Design a protein around this ligand. Structure first.
Ligand SMILES: Cn1cncc1[C@@](N)(c1ccc(Cl)cc1)c1ccc2c(c1)c(-c1cccc(Cl)c1)cc(=O)n2C
Ligand SMILES: CC(C)=CCC/C(C)=C/CC/C(C)=C/CONC(=O)CP(=O)(O)O
Ligand SMILES: O=S(=O)(O)C[C@H](O)CNC1CCCCC1
Ligand SMILES: O=S(=O)(O)C[C@H](O)CNC1CCCCC1
Ligand SMILES: O=S(=O)(O)C[C@H](O)CNC1CCCCC1
Ligand SMILES: [Zn+2]
Lengths: 485, 315
């Protein structure tokens, strides 16, 4: 299992060399190396049987993390006003982390989650960062609310899924209002264009059966032009005057690379001709693995070249690895196995460096020296899950899915904005529904692929790449909207 | 003490609207009296779609308390355009925001909208503003993306002169001199020299660029930014790796390496990567496999699995 995933404790820790050229980047790096390596030195090797006397025990402190998320759950201090336009994210970070940690909400609490989120839904379409009487709809809280409804909701009259189903046409119309001719989307009325919006929209459109040709036109081209010379993806591409050329607008970054890989992956399910425009999968895989930090910085991921490692990149970068790997696999097959990143070291970074010091607030954090928060709790745990569980997109699972799909069952077709904006006919629409549903349910945990650093009490549940909700949430949720139950 | 808005003569005609969370909401935030009051009145203002000076003042009050409130920013920009307000004054206000540490993405996006609508014949002063804001915060991701947008937008309008492009490269060169490990400035160099539509591509252009890249590597051999740029450059222009190999070979053991600078332990893993890829270019797959094996087992063990994957690709 671990021949090609050495423990940080088994490797020589050495600083990034200076080449006798000091700089601000190197000063910060050296300082961070010192901080992380010193915490590792104070902590017992999680892999040891002779769990060392005098040293900190690295076991995942699930109960502390649960208490951290609870206290944020039902009343937040005044300082949280900075996240008043991100309340659905607060919900998602909480409920998804609780799922990963194996902690159940009672039905009464789940009902409060559903009711809260329904008050964020506008009749005209989409969820905003707070109540519909206070905030306009936005692609990001639309993803966060939809996913949280998958986690906390159900098919009953008070379960929220029914309301989402009734909202399909309006959500679709919101997505079309966000659409730009070059294939990008604004995140909200008057808002920024970026690939996070594309990602959030494509996840929701996939889950709710509201994908159309007009919704997707140029969307692949926008995403593909986000890829930088480094192999990762920037937040956006700029269309020069449909466009004569498209150019990436910033650095390859973990967050935008995750969004671009996932968006591109979602598009590969869609049966349009010559669609989606290809990305350079080999380069994206290379960029991904290159972001894993050295032993001295604990084997955590950084978000961009020559910046610092940070626990949230365990999800953004580590969670993009199975996607990049699958795209590389497909490319190789179209011309014509060891782990692709250090799954052990990433777990060690999480357990040793990313957890709040014991006997305090709980929660997980960017790095030592930083306060934990809900966002870093969710993303550290999501990345931990990807490292513990070998995730594959399985062609034979997708084939089984196609075989069991019932195209005669479904919710009403979306009415396109433009007369010819829908699928050509029912054969094509149903084929599209089948492919999109079958591929969404194609991710599997490989048998015998589990690596739980530190022993089985550290095991968390399996998140799904691309979506980032548990497979046990994803399946009944997408089955509800496709009437496949 | 605070004066509630229900007691202000200027707001007497307005009936505030309460936040509608429903009963017993999750993730409720404890709000200051001031923020709750401002939002109760904003709800009323926005519901009736009032475009007025008092509404404009109210949006400033709110975004000063919560700079990330995208809804209130959207309403603010609607107000600026409806009232035909001075957009230059608004930019000055955004300048004042930065001085008062009121930064957020929404502030920068608001600047972008203002620049787009003002549509100045020459955007030099905003370029200089961006430069000044990067000096103390040199890797700010969204500031760099804004700089890319500004140049891209104004260049499609034909408003960036050759002198302007020239001074921009000079500024970029200085940023990389100050910190050669600044990947954001390397990304900007790529736009300036390679990706932008107006970039020159000639034999001398490629030559000059290669010289700059190799010199950068020789100055800081372990600098991942410079290696990735080298690899991106050769790939983009379909240039073979082999003819440059003499400049790289010393790191595996046109500008050539220095005695190497102190604190330069060998081998440099990305120099080995370059060597392996050059063997592959030559169809020498066994020799490439041998290098990948060494990267995997000895020289870059964090990526043992990846280098093993590359090794297996060869055999
Ligand atoms: C770049 N980064 C790396 N780690 C954290 C950050 C970030 N600068 C950030 C900003 C925007 C987005 Cl879309 C994602 C991440 C950051 C840092 C700290 C943060 C939050 C975000 C966020 C946050 C807030 C809203 C959305 C998202 Cl995705 C994240 C919440 C929070 O409580 N804290 C402490
Ligand atoms: C809603 C979603 C999916 C958002 C994407 C998540 C991320 C990581 C977005 C990127 C946000 C970003 C680039 C913030 C800028 O802050 N970055 C830094 O301060 C430097 P670093 O890249 O090293 O964190
Ligand atoms: O989140 S965890 O770290 O697993 C849980 C905390 O350590 C709780 N420890 C208790 C202290 C008193 C004796 C019973 C155990
Ligand atoms: O019919 S819908 O438009 O979906 C429902 C309401 O009108 C939403 N309008 C809010 C008013 C206050 C500011 C945020 C928007
Ligand atoms: O299942 S196994 O991996 O063999 C071993 C257990 O999970 C070990 N977990 C510890 C039990 C004692 C308290 C600290 C955690
Ligand atoms: Zn982070």
């Amino acid at each position: 299992a671990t021949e090609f995933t050495p423990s940080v404790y088994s490797l020589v820790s050495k600083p990034l060399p200076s080449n006798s050229r000091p700089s601000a980047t190197l000063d910060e790096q050296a300082e961070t190396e010192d901080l992380i390596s010193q915490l590792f030195d104070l902590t017992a090797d999680p892999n040891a049987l002779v769990s060392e006397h005098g040293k900190r025990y690295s076991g995942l402190r699930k109960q502390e993390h649960t208490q951290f998320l609870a206290s944020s759950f039902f009343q937040l201090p005044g300082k949280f006003v900075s996240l008043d336009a991100s309340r659905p994210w607060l919900v998602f970070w909480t409920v998804h982390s609780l799922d990963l940690l194996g902690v159940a909400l009672d039905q009464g609490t789940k009902d409060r989650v559903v009711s809260t989120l329904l008050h964020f839904l506008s009749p005209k379409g989409g969820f905003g960062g707070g109540p519909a009487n206070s905030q306009i709809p936005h692609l990001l809280p639309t993803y966060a609310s939809v996913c949280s409804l998958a986690i906390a909701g159900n098919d009953s009259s008070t379960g929220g899924w029914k309301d989402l189903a009734a909202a399909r046409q309006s959500i679709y119309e919101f997505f079309m209002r966000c659409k730009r001719p070059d294939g990008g989307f604004v995140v909200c009325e008057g808002g920024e264009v970026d690939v996070r919006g594309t990602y959030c929209l494509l996840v929701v459109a996939t889950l709710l059966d509201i994908i159309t040709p007009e919704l997707l036109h140029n969307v692949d081209k926008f995403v593909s032009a986000c890829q930088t010379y480094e192999g990762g993806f920037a937040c956006a591409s700029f269309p020069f005057p449909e466009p004569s050329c498209r150019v990436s607008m910033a650095e390859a970054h973990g967050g935008y690379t995750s969004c671009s890989l996932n968006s591109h992956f979602l598009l590969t399910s869609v049966p349009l001709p010559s669609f989606p425009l290809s990305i350079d999968a080999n380069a994206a895989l290379r960029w991904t693995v290159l972001q894993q930090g050295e032993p001295i910085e604990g084997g955590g991921f950084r978000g961009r070249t020559n910046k610092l490692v940070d626990g949230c990149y365990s999800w953004w970068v580590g969670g993009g690895a199975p996607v990049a790997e699958e795209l590389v696999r497909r490319e190789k097959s179209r011309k014509v196995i060891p782990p692709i990143f250090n799954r052990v070291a990433l777990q060690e970074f999480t357990l040793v460096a990313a957890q709040q010091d014991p006997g305090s607030t709980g929660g997980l954090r960017d790095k030592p020296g930083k306060r934990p928060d809900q966002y870093h709790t969710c993303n550290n745990l999501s990345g931990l899950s990807i490292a513990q569980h070998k995730m594959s997109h399985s062609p034979s699972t997708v084939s089984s899915n196609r075989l069991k799909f019932d195209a005669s069952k479904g919710l009403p077709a979306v009415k396109p904005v433009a007369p010819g904006g829908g699928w050509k006919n029912e054969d094509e629409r149903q084929n599209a529904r089948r492919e999109i549903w079958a591929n969404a349910l194609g991710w599997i945990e490989e048998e015998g692929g589990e690596i739980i650093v530190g022993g089985k009490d550290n095991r968390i549940n399996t998140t799904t790449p691309v979506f980032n909700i548990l497979g046990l949430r994803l399946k009944p949720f997408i089955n509800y909207f496709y009437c496949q139950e | 003490t605070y004066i509630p808005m229900s007691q202000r003569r200027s707001w007497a005609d307005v009936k505030p609207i309460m936040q509608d969370d429903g009963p017993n909401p999750v993730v409720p935030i404890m709000y200051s009296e001031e923020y709750k009051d401002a939002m109760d009145y904003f709800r009323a203002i926005a519901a009736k779609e009032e475009k007025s000076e008092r509404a404009l003042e109210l949006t400033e009050i709110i975004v000063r308390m919560n700079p990330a409130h995208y809804t209130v920013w959207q309403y603010r920009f609607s107000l600026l355009t409806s009232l035909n307000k001075s957009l230059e004054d608004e930019l000055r206000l955004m300048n004042e925001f930065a001085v008062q540490n009121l930064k957020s993405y929404q502030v920068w996006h608001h600047r972008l909208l203002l620049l787009d609508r003002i549509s100045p014949q020459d955007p030099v002063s905003e370029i200089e503003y961006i430069h000044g804001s990067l000096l103390p915060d040199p890797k700010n991701y969204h500031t760099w993306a804004y700089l890319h947008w500004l140049y891209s937008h104004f260049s499609t309008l034909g408003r960036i002169s050759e002198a302007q492009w020239g001074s921009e490269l000079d500024w970029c060169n200085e940023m990389l001199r100050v910190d050669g490990r600044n990947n954001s400035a390397w990304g900007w160099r790529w736009y300036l020299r390679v990706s932008r539509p107006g970039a020159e591509t000639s034999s001398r252009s490629l030559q000059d660029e290669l010289i700059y890249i190799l010199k950068s590597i020789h100055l800081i051999p372990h600098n991942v930014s410079a290696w990735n740029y080298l690899r991106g450059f050769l790939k983009h222009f379909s240039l073979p790796l082999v003819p440059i190999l003499p400049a790289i070979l010393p790191y595996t053991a046109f500008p050539m390496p220095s005695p190497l600078p102190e604190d330069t332990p060998l081998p440099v893993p990305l120099a080995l990567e370059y060597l392996a890829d050059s063997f592959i270019e030559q169809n020498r797959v066994d020799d490439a496999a041998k290098v990948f094996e060494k990267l995997s087992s000895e020289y870059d063990q964090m990526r043992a699995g990846y280098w093993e994957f590359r090794r297996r690709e060869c055999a």
